[PDB]
Amino acid sequence: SITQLFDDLCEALLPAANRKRAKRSLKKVAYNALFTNLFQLPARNKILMLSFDLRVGGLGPKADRLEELVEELEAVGSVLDLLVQLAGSGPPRDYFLNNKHVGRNVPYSGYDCDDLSVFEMDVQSLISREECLCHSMIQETLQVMEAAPGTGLPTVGL
Amino acid sequence: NLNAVRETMDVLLEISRILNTGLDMETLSICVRLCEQGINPEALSSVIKELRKATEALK
Amino acid sequence: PVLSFLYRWIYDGELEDTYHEFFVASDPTVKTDRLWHDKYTLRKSMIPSFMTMDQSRKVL
Amino acid sequence: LMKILTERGYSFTTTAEREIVRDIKEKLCYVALDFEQEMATAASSSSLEKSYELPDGQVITIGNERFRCPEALFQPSFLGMESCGIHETTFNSIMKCDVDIRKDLYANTVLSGGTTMYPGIADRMQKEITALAPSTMKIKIIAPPERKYSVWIGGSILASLSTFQQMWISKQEYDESGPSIVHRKCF
Amino acid sequence: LQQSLELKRKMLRDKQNKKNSGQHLPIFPAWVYERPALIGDFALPIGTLPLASQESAVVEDLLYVLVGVDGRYVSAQPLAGRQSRTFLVDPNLDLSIRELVHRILPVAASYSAVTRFIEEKSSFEYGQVNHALAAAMRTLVKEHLILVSQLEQLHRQGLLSLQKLWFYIQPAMRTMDILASLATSVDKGECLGGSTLSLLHDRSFSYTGDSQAQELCLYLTKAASAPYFEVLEKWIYRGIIHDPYSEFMVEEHELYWDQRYTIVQQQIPSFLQKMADKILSTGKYLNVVRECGHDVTCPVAKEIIYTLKERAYVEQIEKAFNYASKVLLDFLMEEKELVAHLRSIKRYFLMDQGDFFVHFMDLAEEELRKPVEDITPPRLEALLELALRMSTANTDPFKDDLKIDLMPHDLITQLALSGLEAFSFDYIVKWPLSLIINRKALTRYQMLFRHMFYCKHVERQLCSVWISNKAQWFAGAFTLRQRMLNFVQNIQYYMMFEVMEPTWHILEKNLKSASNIDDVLGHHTGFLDTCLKDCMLTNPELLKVFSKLMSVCVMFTNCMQKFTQSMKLLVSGFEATINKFDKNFSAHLLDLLARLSIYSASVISRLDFNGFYTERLERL
């Protein structure tokens, strides 16, 4: 039932540490924020507006995949309308990308070399993450060494 | 029926991963069971954002 | 430290100390309704001066 | 349940037996999709009775009579009630509201009743709510199988809230403007 | 240190034999501890410098001494046998700074004996509770290293001196000093299982007013409870464990009701002592149903964590008790019934059947009369099998359990023999009910059954001489037999309608009010013992008057009378024996009533029904 499903939702989003009075109080905001919208044009078309924004900034086959599933999801319509609202409130290679040295019955295409510049950015993004790691190892310890004892030790905080 | 609603849960799984939502697997299974009742889906987006803000203030 | 035992003495009737630093003492009894008449008397070297004698007897 | 059992011919006169059937009607009771189909199913073969074994030795329950006690929700005159049934009263209520606010009220229609200790009442209720409004829009009903304490859980959240203090009335205004303003300030 | 090697040899050798969940466990890599390269804790003159320069050299070397390594102006002297290693700062230093140094060196001494703890106690031999105990002390080392790094950053910029240093390191002389106290007592002696968790439970009320160290001690014992509760989360929901390190309160074996699971008493922590019996109970009741298969899953499942002043881990044991001891009870009473098996033992041994036994007495009389080395057990089995089939006592499915068994006693083993007085049954029992009702219960049943057999026997023997006499003029024996007959029937009314039949009703009402097998076995052993004590078996003197009574009654009915030697169809020599037997009978009857009088009433009050021999003589 619904009065339990607000208690289960509040459990998954919060790992246990209190957790004896606070769980009852976070179920209170579970009732209290559900009605703020309720106080104050197809459904599958709301997926297509996102599939447009995929193909605009590249990756066609992904946009073909989002529309492939929702068309077999028509044969449940109230479910997808929740997913489209939480889609901008979430978190912020391989041998096969631009290959032509493989394949059997491939038509002629000639040289392209304007996506070869987007063959170096697939790898530049990987190695720029593996340097920001080294930028997040020298910071997380110098932010503790520079400050007085109490910032990494709870006991000198007593 | 449970074979049928299993396969609908699998297809709903993939569309919620490529859209990079704030949900995970278990909270997705809760919300699909919740909207199965008839609960307004514009309403569940307003509760989850505020519940996740009030839980983050404890941490 | 002394107050910690005293707020389990009026909410659980027990002390939990081992160095005997409060006036309440527990004397072994036959446990046949002479507990009331034999067990609890004050140790008159361990009463704090922040507790008056009326308070010391009422918590007992 | 006293009435139909004593009309049936079974000896039932005492208050302790009434306490035991009140307990069994609230907790153990079977309800199904409809009373006619389960009546035919029980008449063709009897296995609907689950035994109740108390140490006192009083065994009173029978399966077929306990689902036909709340039957007044679909056809009310099985109880001998001249008041219209549950489906008919909610249909009568939504017709005498406005036709413009009808869909919005029908977007949240609510189930209640302490009889939700046994779940299964909601499925038949969902069938009757499908039958209730004409085929114009789909059903949007809130129907959880725990609603016995619904009136309680409402007040427990409502009176706690700090914003609700601006609707709550104190003694100062109450002495300044008489008692009758508790109809208006608080409502 | 040498001791560790011995502690690792004694442990593993102790582990393998103790339980069967895996034997001959591997020996941990010893070369790790042998090489001194894995041990944590370990220039210019200090004399010729001005006083402030001495202060600046000394705070520099003390910052290095905070962990175990000597810097420049400090050296390491031997560790010799001391359990808290001090350091030897560079000689020729002034006596002013020596005092400040000796204020600070106990902190490094309370770190030297924590690294020597952790970097030894992680092996397989030390169990798997010493692992997580030393990984809640391993976190503590990491915050100590945070401390020494922050101080190095301050020290380079001239922002560290002796007083600031002493101010910074004092909360860790009450959070690392605590570990330097527990370490030199956990290592000393053999400390496994719950005893370590109790040694972290007695130090939460030796600093309960201090309030800085109590929460540290509560964290330490919430992490040493983590591996123990993993094993308990096998034992509480199913009857088995597989923890081949004997670090548990329960010790498995390879043997069921008391044999396979034997408790070790120094492996139960102080917050599990009160509920130890329930833990053992739950696991045993689960495993014996796991042997008939059928179901072992518990509906409630909860993950377990320690709480001081709360129950969430000494609470779930009750909900496992109320599932395990109820599913075993349900399995027993409704599948291969113990409600019906006890009734079918009562049916024969406690003489519920009367069709069966009067048919049995007549059909088997001849062989019973035959003494030993003339008795024939297969003919007795065949006679029993016919007597069951002709009578209606065949209403129970366990009738076949009756066999022929011989007793080489005439209840003289109560603290060869003729066929009447060696007769016995052996009733076979099934395996699930064998754990509950054992050999002692059957033997006590059997002695009761033998006792009532004599009374039914001598009753038949009186009725035979009674029918043969009915001469007509003769009525001499007709009076003595009548006295004896009324007596031997009033004993069989008193025993049957006082000792046995109401107390059996009491027993079946008590069994309905019992939810654990210990309760139902207590009820049954009480009923069995008390009914035995009321009859003439289990007594401090055995009350031998009854044993002489049966002998003189059988001697009267056939072995002197010979059915009044066919004068019913000698010279009054047998009438004198009738007189003699009556006087002897009066004596025996008075003695039995007197012994009932002196030891702690209803049989006297009704044998003497209208004052019929309430007075015949007085003792002394």
Swiss-Prot record, chain A:
Domain of life: Eukaryota
Signal peptide as annotated in the record: none
Subunit organization: Component of the gamma-tubulin ring complex (gTuRC) consisting of TUBGCP2, TUBGCP3, TUBGCP4, TUBGCP5 and TUBGCP6 and gamma-tubulin TUBG1 or TUBG2. TUBGCP2, TUBGCP3, TUBGCP4, TUBGCP5 and TUBGCP6 assemble in a 5:5:2:1:1 stoichiometry; each is associated with a gamma-tubulin, thereby arranging 14 gamma-tubulins in a helical manner. Gamma-tubulin at the first position is blocked by TUBGCP3 at the last position, allowing 13 protafilaments to grow into a microtubule.
Involvement in disorder: Microcephaly and chorioretinopathy, autosomal recessive, 1: A syndrome characterized by microcephaly, cognitive impairment, underdeveloped retina and choroid, and epilepsy in some patients. The more anterior parts of the retina, near the periphery and pars plana, have a grayish hue and diminutive vasculature similar to retinopathy of prematurity. Visual impairment becomes evident during the first year of life.
Protein function: Component of the gamma-tubulin ring complex (gTuRC) which mediates microtubule nucleation. The gTuRC regulates the minus-end nucleation of alpha-beta tubulin heterodimers that grow into microtubule protafilaments, a critical step in centrosome duplication and spindle formation.
Family per record: Belongs to the TUBGCP family.
The protein's name: Gamma-tubulin complex component 6
Gene: TUBGCP6
From Swiss-Prot, chain B:
One BP term from GO: mitotic spindle assembly
Subcellular localization: Cytoplasm, Cytoskeleton, Microtubule organizing center, Centrosome; Cytoplasm, Cytoskeleton, Spindle
GO CC annotations, alphabetized: centrosome; cytosol; gamma-tubulin ring complex; interphase microtubule organizing center; spindle
Keyword line: Acetylation, Cytoplasm, Cytoskeleton
Major localization listed first in the record, in broad terms: cytoplasm
UniProt keyword Cytoplasm present: yes
Subunit-level organization: Associates with the gamma-tubulin ring complex (gTuRC) consisting of TUBGCP2, TUBGCP3, TUBGCP4, TUBGCP5 and TUBGCP6 and gamma-tubulin TUBG1 or TUBG2; within the complex, interacts with TUBGCP3 and TUBGCP6 to form a luminal bridge with actin that stabilizes the initial structure during complex assembly. Interacts with TUBG1.
Family classification: Belongs to the MOZART1 family.
Protein's name in the database: Mitotic-spindle organizing protein 1
Residue span relative to the full protein: 17 to 75 of 82
Swiss-Prot record, chain C:
UniProt tissue specificity: Ubiquitously expressed.
Superkingdom of source: Eukaryota
Residues annotated as signal peptide: none
UniProt subcellular location: Cytoplasm, Cytoskeleton, Microtubule organizing center, Centrosome
Similarity comment: family membership: Belongs to the TUBGCP family.
Function of the protein: Component of the gamma-tubulin ring complex (gTuRC) which mediates microtubule nucleation. The gTuRC regulates the minus-end nucleation of alpha-beta tubulin heterodimers that grow into microtubule protafilaments, a critical step in centrosome duplication and spindle formation.
Subunit comment: Component of the gamma-tubulin ring complex (gTuRC) consisting of TUBGCP2, TUBGCP3, TUBGCP4, TUBGCP5 and TUBGCP6 and gamma-tubulin TUBG1 or TUBG2. TUBGCP2, TUBGCP3, TUBGCP4, TUBGCP5 and TUBGCP6 assemble in a 5:5:2:1:1 stoichiometry; each is associated with a gamma-tubulin, thereby arranging 14 gamma-tubulins in a helical manner. Gamma-tubulin at the first position is blocked by TUBGCP3 at the last position, allowing 13 protafilaments to grow into a microtubule.
Name of the protein: Gamma-tubulin complex component 3
Source organism of this protein record: Homo sapiens
Lineage: Eukaryota, Metazoa, Chordata, Craniata, Vertebrata
Gene (name only): TUBGCP3
Interval of the full protein contained in this chain: 425 to 484 of 907
From Swiss-Prot, chain E:
Location in or out of the cell: Cytoplasm, Cytoskeleton, Microtubule organizing center, Centrosome
UniProt keywords, alphabetically: Cytoplasm, Cytoskeleton, Disease variant, Epilepsy, Intellectual disability, Lissencephaly, Microtubule, Phosphoprotein
Tissue: Ubiquitously expressed.
Primary location class: cytoplasm
GO process annotations (BP): brain development; cytoplasmic microtubule organization; meiotic cell cycle; microtubule nucleation; mitotic cell cycle; neuron migration; protein-containing complex assembly; spindle assembly
GO molecular function terms noted in the UniProt entry: gamma-tubulin binding
Top-level taxon of the source organism: Eukaryota
GO CC field: centrosome; ciliary basal body; cytoplasmic microtubule; cytosol; gamma-tubulin complex; membrane; microtubule organizing center; nucleoplasm
Family per similarity comment: Belongs to the TUBGCP family.
Role of this protein: Component of the gamma-tubulin ring complex (gTuRC) which mediates microtubule nucleation. The gTuRC regulates the minus-end nucleation of alpha-beta tubulin heterodimers that grow into microtubule protafilaments, a critical step in centrosome duplication and spindle formation. Plays a role in neuronal migration.
Name listed for the protein in its UniProt record: Gamma-tubulin complex component 2
Lineage: Eukaryota, Metazoa, Chordata, Craniata, Vertebrata
Gene name, Swiss-Prot/TrEMBL: TUBGCP2
Full-protein interval shown: 150 to 872 of 902
